[PDB]
Design a protein around this ligand. Structure first.
Ligand SMILES: [Mg+2]
Ligand SMILES: [Mg+2]
Ligand SMILES: [Mg+2]
Ligand SMILES: [Mg+2]
Ligand SMILES: [Mg+2]
Ligand SMILES: [Mg+2]
Ligand SMILES: [Mg+2]
Ligand SMILES: [Mg+2]
Ligand SMILES: [Mg+2]
Ligand SMILES: [Mg+2]
Ligand SMILES: [Mg+2]
Ligand SMILES: [Mg+2]
Ligand SMILES: [Mg+2]
Ligand SMILES: [Mg+2]
Ligand SMILES: [Mg+2]
Ligand SMILES: [Mg+2]
Ligand SMILES: [Mg+2]
Ligand SMILES: [Mg+2]
Ligand SMILES: [Mg+2]
Ligand SMILES: [Mg+2]
Ligand SMILES: [Mg+2]
Ligand SMILES: [Mg+2]
Ligand SMILES: [Mg+2]
Ligand SMILES: [Mg+2]
Ligand SMILES: [Mg+2]
Ligand SMILES: [Mg+2]
Ligand SMILES: [Mg+2]
Ligand SMILES: [Mg+2]
Ligand SMILES: [Mg+2]
Lengths: 51, 51, 147, 51, 104, 124, 134, 187
RNA sequence: GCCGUCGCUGGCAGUCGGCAGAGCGAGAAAGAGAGUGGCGCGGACGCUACGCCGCGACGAGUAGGAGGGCCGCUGCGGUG
RNA sequence: UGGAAUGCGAGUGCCUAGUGGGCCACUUUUGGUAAGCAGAACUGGCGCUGCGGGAUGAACCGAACGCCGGGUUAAGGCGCC
RNA sequence: ACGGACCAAGGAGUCUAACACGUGCGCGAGUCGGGGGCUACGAAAGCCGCCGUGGCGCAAUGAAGGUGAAGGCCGGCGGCGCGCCGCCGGCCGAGGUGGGAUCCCGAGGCCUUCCAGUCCGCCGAGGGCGCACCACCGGCCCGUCUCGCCCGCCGCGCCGG
RNA sequence: GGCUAAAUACCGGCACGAGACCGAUAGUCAACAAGUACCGUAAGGGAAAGUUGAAAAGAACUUUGAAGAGAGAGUUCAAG
């Protein structure tokens, strides 16, 4: 094994932004959060905002 | 979040040129699509007999 | 991903995908582009025709920026200015003609391929083509030169 | 879809305050788990050290 | 080190494994090869075929109006033949009704 | 939407369990516990659950109200039925039919509210 | 977490700085908690164990309410020998059973002219941390 | 035993899309339903094109959609595409168009909406006209890719204008022997 | 009889239920269409649609190719 | 009246491993006295291929292979093995 | 014919660069910050657009000097001798033929006692616009050859078109 | 004829931190009294070798035999 193996990958900026918007649009769905395992059976509302 | 990404008509203000990715389909409820009189009327009767 | 590669289904078969009769030896044809004239002539003639020989004059100290000339076609000439300049010249009535400066956009020569919209223009450019200038006269317009 | 509700900020005592905020448009972008995964399994190859 | 010199043994079967197919017969075959002077006069004929258009309609519409005075001038056994008519789903609908009423 | 988050949950859930050539699901309000679009208790807009009552006897029924959809706290309504084995199996039946509330789940709900009574009788 | 970029979170480096520690560092390593009767007196939670201190074992086979004098501090084995924690060899002679300082609580310090300096030091920096917090 | 040959028993058509996105795998569900439950050979073609790879459904240009929707007769119809609708900056006038495609670039949405046309989706189309009555199927140029210029008869062959694979193109890159009638020959 | 592959680019979102009416196998291109005048509250299963179901034909194989492995090994991000 | 019969869905495009020592047989066939020899032509095989027969067997006769029950055959057989 | 007494562990298509095709994804006549700069895990992630220089794509052709990608009809004027040539002012406008998924029209018809009788649908003789693609013929750009006649003007020419 | 920092390089040295690396036939040849033992006249070549248990509590004492060795007994959660 050598040290000039390709370790790092580069991604398109518009695709990192597509992935961020897709990872935020999926955090406001009770099913997609209760399926990741979180125990949110008593959260009053999913987009939980505080003062 | 809107000044960062922003709705599909107002661009992103904090980024240089970014608009939320468009949608490949709007009414993602293909149950409501499929049991709708528009489409329900344009179908042949189901051949649900096993021979 | 090695787990997706082809050497993961090749465990247990003796020749490892490479032949029983003719083994996978090291260099059974020479290294690199060897035998371009002797035993790889059918390939260097069926796929790289004209690869062998000289032609033309040499140019020792070539500098790639004396011969700099990026071109723009007439079809996308009207794309250099904003939209409220072409429609402002549409709604215009005093015959005024917008000045499209091309060397300001980054092209030196103007080639004339596409159609033009019927309105006058003043195309500032460094070099013009005969047809590019005729398509501009035939619509009414001036071909300014800029050194 | 297009209907963006009005989430309600929750005071620090748990009870909902009076402040409301209209759901930013990011929370309706398309959910693309394949894009999210492709981006994650490439971006986390970058924090890796040689060996 | 004498090796077999030449053979055609398996060849007549490799040829037929993927068939021997006649070439693709298309209409409007190419005009490459035809003699220059002839194909130059055929190009001068095409270049000017349009020159006799407004005279060509004057005849096509003529014989098409004449097409009006052309066309508007002219303008095994009884048993199994009756059963093959009663047994027609559409044509035999009334010979069938005449029998259905028959049993009343 | 339902079909969207089902096309997201069909394989990368945390309740999904895959061993012994079977594939069940441990969702809260999944009755028959099997991984399917129809019986999943988190994807739809109206689900039904039939749990055992917290004490010894009874069967709780958990309907998901329509109005509150992004409010997990005030989303589900629960009704404890501590009655005989038949009145409760005609009350769940009415709760589902007369309300016309996800009606293809009724026989599953009866079979589950019978499994609970059977697993709450005195053993032998 | 720890954010000091100069401290070693590695495992084997702490497991090596432990076993190859010099004696004067092994003295701090072999500290021991104070009993809740001297804690409310001195405002000090633990002290490097000295020789002539009275102690009481809390974890192990010899854990109880018997108090004993620390007989010796065998800092090379990271252990101490107390008065009446012992064992009988096969022939009959008795040996002192070593106890780790962390499994034993001190009930009467041996106040020197230096253990008083260490106590007042800890007390000082503790009132300084209480004023730093309150 | 029977003396058949199984060389061609496995038909190689695409049974389903190779992508794993779920806004396409739902369109393909709706259109596979329409395809099997209707007798319209439109839905079957839309489905068979929703399977096709990204190189078989190429982009359309706005100008080519203009000249393909200006043909006489097909007015007030919806232009259906399965690929994407790219912009065409070398066209100045845009009419009103009812369109339905998978993608419309952010500088062609502008032009079409400022013109006044509609931009439907495939679900909107399936609800408007299930059997696809009033539509115009289109598809972008397939031989537009530069790849199709190296395909055909190999270069260095009488009358084979096929493009070769060369590092760079210049005076001294494959211009000497199999090209000059002087140096050797040419084809 | 059973297993599998291929083909039918086959069928099934119709589980349309007291807001009900339970059908599309039958030789013959197309509507169990509209209007316009002469008690007892009841009804199995299904549908991870990447799923389920029905039909036929087929099943050798070195070199080689491809696919599918809820076959196996070690570590990483999540999750049980 | 889609202009003979019978049969059968075809057409097209890229990328491509392995191979480039062959051998046998019916028939024709060249050198050689001939050869289990050297060399060609057509087709079928062995190689890459089991199974029943030929006692045995690369190539001969029958016949080509998923795993099984019943029935019937091929080529070969039916004093005993 | 060669290797092999036995058992355990180790043991052989790897990584980098280039290229080609296929495939998934984002954007799309654009595209990309990879270099640089700004803001524990984090050496990560985010951001820059007056950081897109530059690469590749958007134009080819010639060794080069260089050049560099539809036209037609209409009048009016000069010339040759009814056409053409040039010259000004009009309007029309990006080829065609064959096959061609798809879509469009629709003669006629799809039953319930009997005729007229509208809306909704569906089938359908025949007729159309024709996607992509394929064949063929034209057209356009550069190099080259042949035969020719004309137009341009600050420099009239071994000039330019 | 002459001088000149910064941006630049660093598998040696001192002091550090980390790891999708190997985990004692691997990882340095060398986790251990390793460039040691050993070989060679020399230049040089150059290994094998980690693990009782929490703590030695490392079996007192009795007994056969000259002893090694046993048979009892005891320590330990366990001498398996
Ligand atoms: Mg093999
Ligand atoms: Mg080998
Ligand atoms: Mg291979
Ligand atoms: Mg080879
Ligand atoms: Mg090799
Ligand atoms: Mg030679
Ligand atoms: Mg068979
Ligand atoms: Mg097989
Ligand atoms: Mg040979
Ligand atoms: Mg060989
Ligand atoms: Mg021989
Ligand atoms: Mg021979
Ligand atoms: Mg063999
Ligand atoms: Mg062989
Ligand atoms: Mg074979
Ligand atoms: Mg055989
Ligand atoms: Mg014999
Ligand atoms: Mg050998
Ligand atoms: Mg041997
Ligand atoms: Mg091994
Ligand atoms: Mg290749
Ligand atoms: Mg590609
Ligand atoms: Mg370059
Ligand atoms: Mg770190
Ligand atoms: Mg070892
Ligand atoms: Mg070892
Ligand atoms: Mg070991
Ligand atoms: Mg070692
Ligand atoms: Mg070992």
């Amino acid at each position: 094994t050598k040290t000039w193996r390709r370790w790092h990958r580069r991604v398109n900026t518009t695709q990192k932004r597509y992935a961020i918007c897709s990872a935020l649009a999926a955090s406001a769905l009770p099913a997609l959060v209760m399926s990741k395992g979180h125990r949110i059976e008593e959260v009053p509302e999913l987009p939980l905002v505080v003062e | 979040l809107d000044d960062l990404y922003g709705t599909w008509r107002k661009a992103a203000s904090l980024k240089s040129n970014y608009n939320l990715p468009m949608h490949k389909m709007l009414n993602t409820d293909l149950s409501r699509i499929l049991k709708s009189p528009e489409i329900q009327r344009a179908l042949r009767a189901p051949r649900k007999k096993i021979h | 991903p090695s787990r997706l590669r082809k050497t993961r289904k090749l465990r247990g078969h003796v020749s490892h995908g490479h032949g029983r009769i003719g083994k996978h030896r090291k260099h059974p044809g020479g290294r690199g582009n060897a035998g371009g004239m002797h035993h790889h002539r059918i390939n260097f003639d069926k796929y790289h025709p004209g690869y062998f020989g000289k032609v033309g004059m040499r140019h020792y100290h070539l500098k790639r920026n004396q011969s700099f000339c990026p071109t723009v076609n007439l079809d996308k000439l009207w794309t250099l200015v904003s939209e409220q300049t072409r429609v402002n010249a549409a709604k215009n009535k005093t015959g005024a003609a917008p000045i499209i400066d091309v060397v300001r956009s980054g092209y030196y020569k103007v080639l004339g391929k596409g159609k033009l919209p019927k309105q006058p223009v003043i195309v500032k450019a460094k070099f013009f083509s005969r047809r590019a200038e005729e398509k501009i006269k035939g619509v009414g317009g001036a071909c300014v030169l800029v050194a | 879809a297009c209907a963006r509700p009005l989430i309600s900020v929750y005071s620090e005592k748990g009870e909902s305050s009076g402040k409301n905020v209209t759901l930013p448009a990011v929370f309706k972008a398309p959910i693309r788990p394949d894009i999210v995964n492709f981006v994650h399994t490439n971006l986390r190859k970058n924090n890796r050290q040689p060996y | 080190a004498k090796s077999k010199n030449h053979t055609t043994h398996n060849q007549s079967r490799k040829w037929h494994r993927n068939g021997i197919k006649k070439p693709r017969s298309q209409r409007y075959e190419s005009l490459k090869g035809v003699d220059p002077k002839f194909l130059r006069n055929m190009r001068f004929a095409k270049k000017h075929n349009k020159k006799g258009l407004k005279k060509m309609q004057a005849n096509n519409a003529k014989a098409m109006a004449a097409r009006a005075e052309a066309i508007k001038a002219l303008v095994v056994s009884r048993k199994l033949h009756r059963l093959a008519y009663i047994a027609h789903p559409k044509l035999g609908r009334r010979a069938r009704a005449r029998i259905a009423r028959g049993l009343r | 939407s339902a079909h969207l988050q089902w096309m997201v949950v069909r394989n990368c859930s945390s309740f999904l369990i895959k061993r012994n050539k079977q594939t069940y699901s441990t969702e809260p309000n999944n009755l028959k516990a099997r991984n399917s679009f129809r019986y999943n208790g988190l994807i739809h807009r109206k689900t039904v659950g039939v749990e055992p009552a917290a004490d010894g006897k009874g069967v709780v029924v958990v309907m998901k109200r329509r109005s509150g959809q992004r409010k997990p706290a005030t989303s589900y309504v629960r009704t404890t039925i501590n009655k005989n084995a038949r009145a409760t199996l005609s009350s769940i039946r009415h709760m589902i039919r007369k309300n016309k509330y996800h009606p293809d789940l009724r026989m599953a709900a009866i079979r589950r509210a019978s499994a609970i009574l059977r697993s709450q009788k005195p053993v032998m | 977490m720890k954010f000091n970029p100069f401290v070693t979170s590695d495992r084997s480096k702490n497991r090596k700085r432990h076993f190859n520690a010099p004696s004067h560092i092994r003295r701090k390593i072999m500290s021991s908690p104070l009993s809740k009767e001297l804690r409310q007196k001195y405002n000090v939670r633990s002290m490097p164990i000295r020789k002539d201190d009275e102690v009481q074992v809390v974890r192990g086979h010899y854990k109880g309410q018997q108090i004993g004098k620390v007989v010796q501090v065998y800092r090379k084995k990271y252990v101490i020998y107390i008065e009446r924690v012992q064992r009988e060899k096969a022939n009959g002679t008795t040996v002192h059973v070593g106890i780790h300082p962390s499994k034993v609580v001190i009930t009467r310090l041996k106040l020197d002219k230096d253990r008083k300096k260490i106590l007042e030091r800890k007390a000082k920096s503790r009132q300084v941390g209480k004023e730093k917090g309150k | 035993g029977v003396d058949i040959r199984h060389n061609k028993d496995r038909k190689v058509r695409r049974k389903e899309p190779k992508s794993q996105d779920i806004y396409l795998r739902l369109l393909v569900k709706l259109y596979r339903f329409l395809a099997r439950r209707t007798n319209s050979t439109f839905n079957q073609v839309v489905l068979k094109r929703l399977f096709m790879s990204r190189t078989n459904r190429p982009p359309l240009s706005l100008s080519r959609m203009i000249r393909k929707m200006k043909l006489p007769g097909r007015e007030n119809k919806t232009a259906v595409v399965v690929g994407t609708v790219t912009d065409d900056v070398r066209v100045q006038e845009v009419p009103k168009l009812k369109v339905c495609a998978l993608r419309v670039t952010s500088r062609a949405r502008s032009r079409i909406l400022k013109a006044g046309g509609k931009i439907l989706t495939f679900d909107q189309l399936a609800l408007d006209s299930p059997k696809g009555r009033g539509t115009v199927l289109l598809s972008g140029p397939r031989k537009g890719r530069e790849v199709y210029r190296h395909f055909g008869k190999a270069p260095g062959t009488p009358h084979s204008h096929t493009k070769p694979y060369v590092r760079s193109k210049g005076r001294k890159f494959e211009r000497a022997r199999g090209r000059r009638a002087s140096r050797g020959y040419k084809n």
